[PDB]
Amino acid sequence: KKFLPFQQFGRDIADTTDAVRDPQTLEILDITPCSFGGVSVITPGTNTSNQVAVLYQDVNCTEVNVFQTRAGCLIGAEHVNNSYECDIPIGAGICASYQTSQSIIAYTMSLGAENSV
């Protein structure tokens, strides 16, 4: 960012300060707020397993068998190839299920068995 020589702070459209000029070094730092989000718990029924996978919504996994996804950071579930139907929804095309020696898996879901007519 290039502030004018007398501007000391920089503001987002929401009137929230998003940059500042270091008063001992006339150059501008971005402020990015400290990372937060929902902690979501993914489970098959307790009539099936007491395994849980945890999704930390909209974090890079750095701030927390660990997967970066467009929904957030998914932990305790293993990424896989085979595209299944959705079982538990997760976001951004990802779903999770409990599958075979059985663990929670995470995958981009299949829409349906393809058919050139």
Partner: protein
Amino acid sequence: AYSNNSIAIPTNFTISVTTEILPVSMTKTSVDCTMYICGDSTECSNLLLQYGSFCTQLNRALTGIAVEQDKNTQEVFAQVKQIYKTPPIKDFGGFNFSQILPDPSKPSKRSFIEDLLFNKVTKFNGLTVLPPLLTDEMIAQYTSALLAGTITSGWTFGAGAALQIPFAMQMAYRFNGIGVTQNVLYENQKLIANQFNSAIGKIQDSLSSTASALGKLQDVVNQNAQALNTLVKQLSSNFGAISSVLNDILSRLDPPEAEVQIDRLITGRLQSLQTYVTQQLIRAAEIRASANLAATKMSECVLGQSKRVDFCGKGYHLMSFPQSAPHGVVFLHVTYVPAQEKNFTTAPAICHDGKAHFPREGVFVSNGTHWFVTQRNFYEPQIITTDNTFVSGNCDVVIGIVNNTVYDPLQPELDS
């Protein structure tokens, strides 16, 4: 130009492609109530618990809207069990779907018209947008399957397993569905394809010219922005406290008076979230009621030929093609419109033997000198025969009957 004996019949038609746009989901959202009201303050959280369940009663509600927006998008688009595909060959009788079928070269496989639609439509205070369960890539794969099923197999993929048909015969069943005889297509097939392909052209230029056409979709995005911008600006309001800034009440006063200055800010920021959640719950119901209509048009319009007047565009409905948009769907309804009418004299019935004759499928007309029977929605005059007419009664019982020769095709054939 009404009279007791005049009818106008169309001598030509125009295949027209109309655009109809519906919103289908909101921006999903969860707000952490406690962080919105009392962000980075345990001293404020200690007071927020005096109000009990309101904090969760609001999170549950916003969860209800967010979980529903993926039901709305599933109901509209996931109306198919199989990802139907077209062949690499494009022998659709002359019908040029290239502008609405996928472009495989782009990293999301949307159509050309879907890129026009995506181009025309556009914080850390507990506020968090959640991604949709279906990415615009998977929404675009469902609309491609619905469209490749429609083109290769007519309505049949909605009823059961897809049963292929030639597209020039599918359009003959369509034409038959609007009460127009199958030969009106096969004799005009290269005209009807050029009318159709011209109409698909006009739609691109209409979409390219302005953003106002997607106004329904843009308004849904605009209202979620206005209600988040308003929810955020209400953090800065005093509500009758000495300040809005929570750390400044937690330093310019001691606890016994800070508790009342904070209850001012909690009572205002809680009235601010109860207002936002109420506005959103009503708004979300306005979009559920639109997603249920888009689902209904996708079933009755795309997956079939609707007979419901003006439900599937102006004119007699032939077929329609679903295209995605950000938070919405677009239907391209193809409709037959009767274009160029001529007046004829007409009569309800005719006399040939004192018994009265009536048209099986159509109406009696005369050019002035000769009487004919023609299909009701297109001028194509048959000479009047015992093959084209049925009988009842006698010529005294009907008001407005006229006399004319009926050809019996069996007479020459018996004499020969």
